[PDB]
Amino acid sequence: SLLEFGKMILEETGKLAIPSYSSYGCYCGGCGSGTPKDATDRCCFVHCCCYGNLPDCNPKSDRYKYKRVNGAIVCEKGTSCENRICECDKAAAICFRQNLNTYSGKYMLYPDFLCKGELKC
């Protein structure tokens, strides 16, 4: 669920999802189109695509279980959808962490009209 995803993000980056990633670039929190602005925005694009591979799952509301094996994120066994949603979220959280060094405030609250493009999953 997006509540867990938010908690996973906070644990990984030290940043609150809802400021930091809910209105970043063209794909973070409310994604539609254009070319990802930077690495962090690309993490969100791939994340939107990952959810897209799961048409009959409900990522925003289905809760999965995960544990931290001192540092590592380990998705615990649930339904097929829960397992796959968890892997999508885990990847996004790791991607965010790997690209914290280029996170840029100038991309927060990025205007829709500047998202011009076509990028297929």
Side-chain angles (χ1 to χ4, degrees), residues 24-85:
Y24 189 102
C26 298
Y27 293 84
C28 298
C31 38
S33 56
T35 300
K37 316 270 58 249
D38 66 359
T40 291
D41 201 13
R42 289 195 285 279
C43 295
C44 295
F45 176 75
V46 172
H47 186 249
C48 305
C49 291
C50 198
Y51 278 181
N53 295 320
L54 319 169
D56 288 348
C57 293
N58 294 272
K60 310 240 171 283
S61 57
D62 195 358
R63 331 224 295 205
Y64 49 78
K65 293 294 187 172
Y66 79 88
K67 56 174 173 171
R68 320 281 317 205
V69 168
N70 57 236
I73 296 174
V74 180
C75 291
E76 292 173 291
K77 181 189 188 59
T79 62
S80 177
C81 275
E82 287 160 1
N83 295 337
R84 296 134 82 197
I85 294 167

Short mmCIF file of all heavy atoms in Angstrom, two decimals, residues 24-85:
data_model
loop_
_atom_site.label_atom_id
_atom_site.label_comp_id
_atom_site.label_asym_id
_atom_site.label_seq_id
_atom_site.Cartn_x
_atom_site.Cartn_y
_atom_site.Cartn_z
N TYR A 24 7.47 15.45 -7.54
CA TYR A 24 8.80 15.62 -8.10
C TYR A 24 8.89 15.25 -9.58
O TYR A 24 8.50 14.15 -9.98
CB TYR A 24 9.78 14.78 -7.27
CG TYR A 24 11.24 15.02 -7.57
CD1 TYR A 24 12.02 15.80 -6.73
CD2 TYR A 24 11.85 14.42 -8.67
CE1 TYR A 24 13.38 15.99 -6.99
CE2 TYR A 24 13.21 14.60 -8.93
CZ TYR A 24 13.96 15.39 -8.08
OH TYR A 24 15.30 15.56 -8.31
N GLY A 25 9.41 16.17 -10.39
CA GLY A 25 9.56 15.91 -11.81
C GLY A 25 8.27 15.58 -12.53
O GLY A 25 7.20 16.11 -12.21
N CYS A 26 8.37 14.69 -13.51
CA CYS A 26 7.22 14.28 -14.32
C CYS A 26 6.54 13.00 -13.88
O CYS A 26 5.37 12.78 -14.24
CB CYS A 26 7.65 14.15 -15.78
SG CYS A 26 8.23 15.73 -16.45
N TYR A 27 7.23 12.18 -13.10
CA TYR A 27 6.69 10.89 -12.68
C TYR A 27 6.53 10.58 -11.21
O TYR A 27 5.88 9.59 -10.87
CB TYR A 27 7.50 9.75 -13.30
CG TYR A 27 7.30 9.73 -14.77
CD1 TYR A 27 8.06 10.54 -15.60
CD2 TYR A 27 6.30 8.96 -15.33
CE1 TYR A 27 7.83 10.59 -16.95
CE2 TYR A 27 6.05 9.00 -16.68
CZ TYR A 27 6.81 9.82 -17.49
OH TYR A 27 6.54 9.88 -18.84
N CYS A 28 7.12 11.38 -10.34
CA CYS A 28 6.99 11.08 -8.92
C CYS A 28 5.68 11.59 -8.31
O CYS A 28 5.44 12.81 -8.24
CB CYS A 28 8.19 11.65 -8.15
SG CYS A 28 9.80 10.93 -8.66
N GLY A 29 4.84 10.65 -7.88
CA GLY A 29 3.56 10.99 -7.26
C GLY A 29 2.64 11.73 -8.20
O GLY A 29 2.62 12.95 -8.22
N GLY A 30 1.85 10.99 -8.97
CA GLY A 30 1.00 11.62 -9.94
C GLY A 30 1.89 11.71 -11.17
O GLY A 30 2.49 12.75 -11.44
N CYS A 31 2.02 10.55 -11.85
CA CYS A 31 2.76 10.38 -13.11
C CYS A 31 1.87 10.25 -14.35
O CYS A 31 0.86 9.56 -14.31
CB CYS A 31 3.71 9.16 -13.04
SG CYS A 31 3.19 7.64 -12.17
N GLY A 32 2.23 10.90 -15.45
CA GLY A 32 1.41 10.80 -16.65
C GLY A 32 2.28 10.69 -17.87
O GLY A 32 2.31 9.66 -18.57
N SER A 33 3.05 11.73 -18.12
CA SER A 33 3.90 11.73 -19.29
C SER A 33 5.11 12.65 -19.31
O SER A 33 5.37 13.41 -18.38
CB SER A 33 3.04 12.04 -20.49
OG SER A 33 2.38 13.27 -20.24
N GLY A 34 5.84 12.55 -20.41
CA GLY A 34 7.04 13.34 -20.62
C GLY A 34 8.28 12.47 -20.47
O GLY A 34 8.24 11.24 -20.37
N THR A 35 9.41 13.15 -20.44
CA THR A 35 10.70 12.51 -20.30
C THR A 35 11.13 12.76 -18.86
O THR A 35 11.06 13.89 -18.38
CB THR A 35 11.74 13.13 -21.25
OG1 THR A 35 11.31 12.98 -22.60
CG2 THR A 35 13.11 12.47 -21.06
N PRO A 36 11.56 11.71 -18.14
CA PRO A 36 11.98 11.88 -16.76
C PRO A 36 13.08 12.93 -16.70
O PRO A 36 14.00 12.90 -17.50
CB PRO A 36 12.46 10.48 -16.38
CG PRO A 36 11.58 9.59 -17.20
CD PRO A 36 11.58 10.29 -18.54
N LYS A 37 12.97 13.86 -15.76
CA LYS A 37 13.93 14.95 -15.61
C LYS A 37 15.33 14.56 -15.14
O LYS A 37 16.32 15.18 -15.55
CB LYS A 37 13.35 16.00 -14.66
CG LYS A 37 11.89 16.33 -14.93
CD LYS A 37 11.69 17.46 -15.92
CE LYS A 37 12.32 17.23 -17.27
NZ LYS A 37 13.48 18.16 -17.47
N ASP A 38 15.42 13.58 -14.25
CA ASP A 38 16.70 13.13 -13.72
C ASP A 38 16.59 11.71 -13.18
O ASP A 38 15.54 11.08 -13.29
CB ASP A 38 17.19 14.07 -12.62
CG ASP A 38 16.30 14.03 -11.40
OD1 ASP A 38 15.30 13.30 -11.41
OD2 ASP A 38 16.62 14.74 -10.43
N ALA A 39 17.69 11.22 -12.61
CA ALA A 39 17.72 9.85 -12.10
C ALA A 39 16.59 9.51 -11.14
O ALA A 39 15.99 8.45 -11.25
CB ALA A 39 19.08 9.55 -11.45
N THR A 40 16.32 10.41 -10.20
CA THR A 40 15.25 10.20 -9.24
C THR A 40 13.91 10.09 -9.96
O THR A 40 13.09 9.24 -9.61
CB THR A 40 15.18 11.36 -8.22
OG1 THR A 40 16.34 11.30 -7.37
CG2 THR A 40 13.92 11.24 -7.35
N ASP A 41 13.68 10.94 -10.95
CA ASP A 41 12.44 10.92 -11.71
C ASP A 41 12.37 9.61 -12.49
O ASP A 41 11.29 9.07 -12.73
CB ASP A 41 12.40 12.12 -12.66
CG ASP A 41 10.98 12.47 -13.10
OD1 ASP A 41 10.02 11.96 -12.49
OD2 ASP A 41 10.83 13.26 -14.05
N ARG A 42 13.53 9.10 -12.88
CA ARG A 42 13.56 7.84 -13.63
C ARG A 42 13.19 6.68 -12.70
O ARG A 42 12.58 5.70 -13.14
CB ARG A 42 14.93 7.61 -14.27
CG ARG A 42 15.20 8.55 -15.44
CD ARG A 42 16.38 8.10 -16.32
NE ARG A 42 17.68 8.34 -15.70
CZ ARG A 42 18.30 9.52 -15.71
NH1 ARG A 42 17.75 10.56 -16.31
NH2 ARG A 42 19.49 9.64 -15.13
N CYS A 43 13.54 6.80 -11.43
CA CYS A 43 13.17 5.76 -10.48
C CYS A 43 11.64 5.69 -10.45
O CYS A 43 11.06 4.61 -10.44
CB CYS A 43 13.65 6.09 -9.07
SG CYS A 43 15.44 6.16 -8.79
N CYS A 44 10.99 6.86 -10.41
CA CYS A 44 9.54 6.91 -10.37
C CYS A 44 8.91 6.38 -11.65
O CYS A 44 7.89 5.70 -11.61
CB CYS A 44 9.06 8.34 -10.11
SG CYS A 44 9.55 8.92 -8.45
N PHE A 45 9.54 6.68 -12.78
CA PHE A 45 9.03 6.20 -14.06
C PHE A 45 9.03 4.67 -14.06
O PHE A 45 8.04 4.04 -14.39
CB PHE A 45 9.93 6.68 -15.21
CG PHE A 45 9.53 6.15 -16.56
CD1 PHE A 45 8.42 6.65 -17.22
CD2 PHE A 45 10.23 5.09 -17.13
CE1 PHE A 45 8.04 6.13 -18.46
CE2 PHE A 45 9.85 4.57 -18.37
CZ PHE A 45 8.74 5.08 -19.02
N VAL A 46 10.17 4.09 -13.69
CA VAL A 46 10.31 2.63 -13.65
C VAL A 46 9.32 2.04 -12.66
O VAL A 46 8.72 0.99 -12.89
CB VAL A 46 11.75 2.23 -13.28
CG1 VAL A 46 11.84 0.72 -13.06
CG2 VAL A 46 12.69 2.66 -14.39
N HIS A 47 9.13 2.75 -11.54
CA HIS A 47 8.17 2.33 -10.54
C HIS A 47 6.73 2.34 -11.08
O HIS A 47 6.00 1.39 -10.86
CB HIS A 47 8.28 3.18 -9.27
CG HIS A 47 7.42 2.71 -8.13
ND1 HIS A 47 6.33 3.43 -7.69
CD2 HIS A 47 7.50 1.61 -7.35
CE1 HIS A 47 5.78 2.79 -6.67
NE2 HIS A 47 6.47 1.68 -6.45
N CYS A 48 6.35 3.40 -11.80
CA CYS A 48 5.04 3.47 -12.43
C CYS A 48 4.90 2.29 -13.41
O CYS A 48 3.86 1.63 -13.48
CB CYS A 48 4.85 4.84 -13.07
SG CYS A 48 5.11 6.24 -11.94
N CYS A 49 5.98 2.03 -14.17
CA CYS A 49 5.99 0.89 -15.13
C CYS A 49 5.85 -0.49 -14.44
O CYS A 49 5.17 -1.41 -14.94
CB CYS A 49 7.29 0.83 -15.96
SG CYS A 49 7.48 2.20 -17.14
N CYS A 50 6.52 -0.63 -13.30
CA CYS A 50 6.48 -1.87 -12.53
C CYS A 50 5.04 -2.16 -12.10
O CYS A 50 4.57 -3.29 -12.20
CB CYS A 50 7.38 -1.71 -11.31
SG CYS A 50 7.88 -3.28 -10.50
N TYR A 51 4.34 -1.13 -11.64
CA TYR A 51 2.94 -1.29 -11.23
C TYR A 51 2.12 -1.62 -12.47
O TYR A 51 1.14 -2.36 -12.40
CB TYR A 51 2.39 0.01 -10.63
CG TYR A 51 2.72 0.25 -9.17
CD1 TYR A 51 2.25 1.40 -8.53
CD2 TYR A 51 3.46 -0.66 -8.42
CE1 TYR A 51 2.49 1.63 -7.18
CE2 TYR A 51 3.71 -0.44 -7.07
CZ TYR A 51 3.22 0.71 -6.45
OH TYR A 51 3.43 0.94 -5.11
N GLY A 52 2.53 -1.05 -13.60
CA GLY A 52 1.83 -1.28 -14.85
C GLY A 52 1.89 -2.72 -15.32
O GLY A 52 1.06 -3.13 -16.14
N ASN A 53 2.87 -3.48 -14.83
CA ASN A 53 2.99 -4.89 -15.19
C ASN A 53 1.96 -5.70 -14.42
O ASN A 53 1.79 -6.89 -14.67
CB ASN A 53 4.38 -5.44 -14.83
CG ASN A 53 5.52 -4.79 -15.61
OD1 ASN A 53 5.40 -4.52 -16.81
ND2 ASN A 53 6.64 -4.57 -14.93
N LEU A 54 1.27 -5.06 -13.47
CA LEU A 54 0.29 -5.74 -12.62
C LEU A 54 -1.14 -5.17 -12.74
O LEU A 54 -1.67 -4.64 -11.78
CB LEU A 54 0.74 -5.63 -11.16
CG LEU A 54 2.23 -5.83 -10.88
CD1 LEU A 54 2.54 -5.41 -9.45
CD2 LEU A 54 2.62 -7.27 -11.13
N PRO A 55 -1.77 -5.32 -13.92
CA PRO A 55 -3.13 -4.83 -14.19
C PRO A 55 -4.23 -5.26 -13.21
O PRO A 55 -5.16 -4.52 -12.96
CB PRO A 55 -3.41 -5.36 -15.61
CG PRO A 55 -2.05 -5.43 -16.21
CD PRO A 55 -1.24 -6.02 -15.09
N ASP A 56 -4.14 -6.47 -12.67
CA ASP A 56 -5.15 -6.95 -11.76
C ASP A 56 -4.79 -6.92 -10.29
O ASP A 56 -5.41 -7.61 -9.47
CB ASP A 56 -5.59 -8.35 -12.20
CG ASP A 56 -6.44 -8.32 -13.47
OD1 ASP A 56 -6.86 -7.22 -13.87
OD2 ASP A 56 -6.69 -9.38 -14.07
N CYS A 57 -3.80 -6.10 -9.96
CA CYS A 57 -3.39 -5.94 -8.57
C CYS A 57 -3.76 -4.52 -8.22
O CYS A 57 -4.02 -3.70 -9.11
CB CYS A 57 -1.88 -6.10 -8.41
SG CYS A 57 -1.23 -7.78 -8.74
N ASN A 58 -3.79 -4.22 -6.92
CA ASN A 58 -4.15 -2.89 -6.45
C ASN A 58 -3.07 -2.40 -5.49
O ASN A 58 -3.22 -2.52 -4.28
CB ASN A 58 -5.51 -2.93 -5.72
CG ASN A 58 -6.66 -3.26 -6.66
OD1 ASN A 58 -7.27 -2.39 -7.27
ND2 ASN A 58 -6.96 -4.54 -6.77
N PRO A 59 -1.97 -1.85 -6.02
CA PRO A 59 -0.80 -1.32 -5.30
C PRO A 59 -1.02 -0.26 -4.23
O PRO A 59 -0.32 -0.24 -3.21
CB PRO A 59 0.08 -0.79 -6.43
CG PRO A 59 -0.30 -1.63 -7.60
CD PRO A 59 -1.81 -1.63 -7.46
N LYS A 60 -1.98 0.63 -4.45
CA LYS A 60 -2.22 1.69 -3.48
C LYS A 60 -2.89 1.23 -2.18
O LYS A 60 -2.61 1.77 -1.10
CB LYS A 60 -3.01 2.83 -4.14
CG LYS A 60 -2.38 3.27 -5.47
CD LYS A 60 -1.97 4.74 -5.47
CE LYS A 60 -1.16 5.12 -6.71
NZ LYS A 60 0.27 4.65 -6.64
N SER A 61 -3.71 0.19 -2.27
CA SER A 61 -4.41 -0.31 -1.09
C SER A 61 -4.06 -1.69 -0.53
O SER A 61 -4.39 -1.98 0.61
CB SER A 61 -5.92 -0.26 -1.36
OG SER A 61 -6.26 -1.00 -2.52
N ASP A 62 -3.42 -2.54 -1.33
CA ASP A 62 -3.06 -3.88 -0.87
C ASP A 62 -1.79 -3.80 -0.03
O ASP A 62 -0.78 -3.28 -0.49
CB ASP A 62 -2.85 -4.79 -2.08
CG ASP A 62 -2.83 -6.27 -1.73
OD1 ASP A 62 -2.95 -6.61 -0.54
OD2 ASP A 62 -2.70 -7.09 -2.65
N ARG A 63 -1.84 -4.31 1.20
CA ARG A 63 -0.68 -4.26 2.08
C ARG A 63 0.10 -5.56 2.06
O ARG A 63 -0.48 -6.65 2.09
CB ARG A 63 -1.11 -3.95 3.52
CG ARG A 63 -2.36 -3.12 3.60
CD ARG A 63 -2.29 -2.00 4.61
NE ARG A 63 -2.16 -2.44 5.99
CZ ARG A 63 -2.54 -1.71 7.04
NH1 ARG A 63 -3.08 -0.51 6.86
NH2 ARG A 63 -2.39 -2.18 8.27
N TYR A 64 1.42 -5.44 1.99
CA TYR A 64 2.29 -6.60 1.99
C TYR A 64 3.10 -6.52 3.28
O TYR A 64 3.03 -5.52 3.99
CB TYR A 64 3.23 -6.57 0.78
CG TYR A 64 3.94 -5.24 0.57
CD1 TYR A 64 5.04 -4.88 1.34
CD2 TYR A 64 3.48 -4.34 -0.39
CE1 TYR A 64 5.67 -3.65 1.16
CE2 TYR A 64 4.11 -3.10 -0.58
CZ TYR A 64 5.20 -2.76 0.20
OH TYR A 64 5.79 -1.52 0.02
N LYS A 65 3.84 -7.57 3.58
CA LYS A 65 4.66 -7.58 4.77
C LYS A 65 6.12 -7.66 4.35
O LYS A 65 6.46 -8.36 3.40
CB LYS A 65 4.33 -8.80 5.64
CG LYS A 65 2.93 -8.80 6.25
CD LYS A 65 2.77 -7.68 7.25
CE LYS A 65 1.43 -7.79 7.97
NZ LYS A 65 1.33 -6.81 9.09
N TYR A 66 6.98 -6.91 5.03
CA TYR A 66 8.39 -6.95 4.72
C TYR A 66 9.16 -6.74 6.02
O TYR A 66 8.63 -6.18 6.97
CB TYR A 66 8.76 -5.89 3.68
CG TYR A 66 8.91 -4.47 4.20
CD1 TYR A 66 10.13 -4.01 4.69
CD2 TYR A 66 7.84 -3.59 4.18
CE1 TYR A 66 10.28 -2.69 5.13
CE2 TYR A 66 7.97 -2.28 4.63
CZ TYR A 66 9.19 -1.83 5.10
OH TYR A 66 9.32 -0.52 5.51
N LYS A 67 10.39 -7.21 6.04
CA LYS A 67 11.25 -7.08 7.21
C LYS A 67 12.60 -6.58 6.72
O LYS A 67 12.91 -6.70 5.54
CB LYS A 67 11.42 -8.45 7.88
CG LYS A 67 11.96 -9.53 6.95
CD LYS A 67 12.26 -10.84 7.67
CE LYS A 67 12.62 -11.94 6.67
NZ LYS A 67 13.12 -13.19 7.32
N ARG A 68 13.37 -6.00 7.63
CA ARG A 68 14.70 -5.52 7.26
C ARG A 68 15.63 -6.55 7.87
O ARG A 68 15.55 -6.84 9.06
CB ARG A 68 15.03 -4.16 7.90
CG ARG A 68 13.92 -3.10 7.96
CD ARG A 68 13.68 -2.35 6.65
NE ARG A 68 14.91 -1.97 5.97
CZ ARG A 68 15.00 -0.95 5.12
NH1 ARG A 68 13.94 -0.20 4.85
NH2 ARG A 68 16.15 -0.70 4.50
N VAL A 69 16.45 -7.17 7.05
CA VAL A 69 17.46 -8.08 7.53
C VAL A 69 18.64 -7.11 7.61
O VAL A 69 19.30 -6.86 6.60
CB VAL A 69 17.65 -9.31 6.62
CG1 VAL A 69 18.92 -10.07 7.00
CG2 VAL A 69 16.44 -10.22 6.68
N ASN A 70 18.90 -6.56 8.79
CA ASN A 70 19.85 -5.46 8.98
C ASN A 70 20.38 -4.85 7.71
O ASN A 70 21.43 -5.22 7.16
CB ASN A 70 20.96 -5.72 10.05
CG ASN A 70 21.83 -6.97 9.80
OD1 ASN A 70 21.92 -7.84 10.67
ND2 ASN A 70 22.51 -7.03 8.66
N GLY A 71 19.56 -3.93 7.23
CA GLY A 71 19.84 -3.19 6.02
C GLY A 71 19.00 -3.61 4.83
O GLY A 71 18.31 -2.79 4.22
N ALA A 72 19.07 -4.89 4.49
CA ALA A 72 18.35 -5.41 3.34
C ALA A 72 16.84 -5.44 3.52
O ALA A 72 16.35 -5.65 4.63
CB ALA A 72 18.86 -6.81 3.01
N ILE A 73 16.12 -5.19 2.44
CA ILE A 73 14.66 -5.23 2.47
C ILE A 73 14.29 -6.63 1.99
O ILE A 73 14.72 -7.05 0.91
CB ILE A 73 14.03 -4.19 1.50
CG1 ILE A 73 14.40 -2.77 1.95
CG2 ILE A 73 12.50 -4.35 1.47
CD1 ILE A 73 13.96 -1.68 0.99
N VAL A 74 13.52 -7.35 2.79
CA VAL A 74 13.11 -8.69 2.42
C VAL A 74 11.59 -8.76 2.38
O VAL A 74 10.93 -8.55 3.39
CB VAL A 74 13.63 -9.74 3.43
CG1 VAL A 74 13.19 -11.13 3.02
CG2 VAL A 74 15.16 -9.67 3.50
N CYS A 75 11.05 -9.02 1.20
CA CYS A 75 9.61 -9.11 1.05
C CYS A 75 9.16 -10.47 1.57
O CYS A 75 9.70 -11.50 1.19
CB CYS A 75 9.20 -8.95 -0.40
SG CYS A 75 9.46 -7.26 -1.03
N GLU A 76 8.18 -10.46 2.46
CA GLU A 76 7.68 -11.70 3.03
C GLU A 76 6.54 -12.26 2.20
O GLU A 76 5.84 -11.53 1.49
CB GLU A 76 7.26 -11.46 4.48
CG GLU A 76 8.46 -11.16 5.37
CD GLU A 76 8.10 -10.75 6.77
OE1 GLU A 76 7.54 -9.65 6.95
OE2 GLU A 76 8.37 -11.54 7.70
N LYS A 77 6.37 -13.58 2.28
CA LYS A 77 5.35 -14.28 1.50
C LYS A 77 3.91 -13.83 1.77
O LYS A 77 3.44 -13.85 2.92
CB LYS A 77 5.47 -15.78 1.76
CG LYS A 77 4.48 -16.61 0.98
CD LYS A 77 4.50 -18.06 1.43
CE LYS A 77 3.65 -18.91 0.52
NZ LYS A 77 4.14 -18.83 -0.89
N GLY A 78 3.23 -13.43 0.70
CA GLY A 78 1.84 -13.02 0.80
C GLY A 78 1.14 -13.54 -0.43
O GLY A 78 1.51 -14.61 -0.91
N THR A 79 0.15 -12.82 -0.93
CA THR A 79 -0.52 -13.26 -2.15
C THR A 79 0.42 -12.91 -3.29
O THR A 79 1.39 -12.18 -3.08
CB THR A 79 -1.85 -12.52 -2.37
OG1 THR A 79 -1.60 -11.11 -2.52
CG2 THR A 79 -2.79 -12.74 -1.19
N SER A 80 0.14 -13.41 -4.48
CA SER A 80 0.99 -13.13 -5.63
C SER A 80 1.12 -11.63 -5.86
O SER A 80 2.21 -11.12 -6.11
CB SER A 80 0.42 -13.80 -6.89
OG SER A 80 1.19 -13.48 -8.03
N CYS A 81 0.00 -10.91 -5.76
CA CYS A 81 0.01 -9.47 -5.97
C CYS A 81 0.86 -8.76 -4.92
O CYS A 81 1.64 -7.87 -5.25
CB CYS A 81 -1.41 -8.91 -5.93
SG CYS A 81 -2.31 -8.99 -7.51
N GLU A 82 0.69 -9.16 -3.67
CA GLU A 82 1.45 -8.55 -2.59
C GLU A 82 2.96 -8.75 -2.77
O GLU A 82 3.75 -7.82 -2.53
CB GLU A 82 0.97 -9.11 -1.25
CG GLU A 82 -0.41 -8.54 -0.89
CD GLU A 82 -1.16 -9.35 0.14
OE1 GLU A 82 -0.62 -10.38 0.62
OE2 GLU A 82 -2.30 -8.97 0.48
N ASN A 83 3.36 -9.94 -3.21
CA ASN A 83 4.78 -10.21 -3.43
C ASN A 83 5.35 -9.31 -4.52
O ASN A 83 6.42 -8.73 -4.36
CB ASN A 83 5.01 -11.67 -3.84
CG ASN A 83 4.64 -12.65 -2.74
OD1 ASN A 83 4.61 -12.30 -1.56
ND2 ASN A 83 4.37 -13.90 -3.13
N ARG A 84 4.62 -9.20 -5.63
CA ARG A 84 5.07 -8.39 -6.75
C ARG A 84 5.05 -6.89 -6.45
O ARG A 84 5.96 -6.16 -6.86
CB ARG A 84 4.21 -8.72 -7.97
CG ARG A 84 4.38 -10.17 -8.43
CD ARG A 84 3.04 -10.84 -8.72
NE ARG A 84 2.52 -10.53 -10.04
CZ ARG A 84 1.25 -10.72 -10.41
NH1 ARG A 84 0.36 -11.20 -9.55
NH2 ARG A 84 0.89 -10.42 -11.64
N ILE A 85 4.03 -6.42 -5.73
CA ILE A 85 3.96 -5.00 -5.37
C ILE A 85 5.15 -4.66 -4.49
O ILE A 85 5.83 -3.65 -4.69
CB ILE A 85 2.65 -4.67 -4.60
CG1 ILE A 85 1.46 -4.87 -5.53
CG2 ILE A 85 2.68 -3.22 -4.12
CD1 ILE A 85 0.11 -4.88 -4.80
#
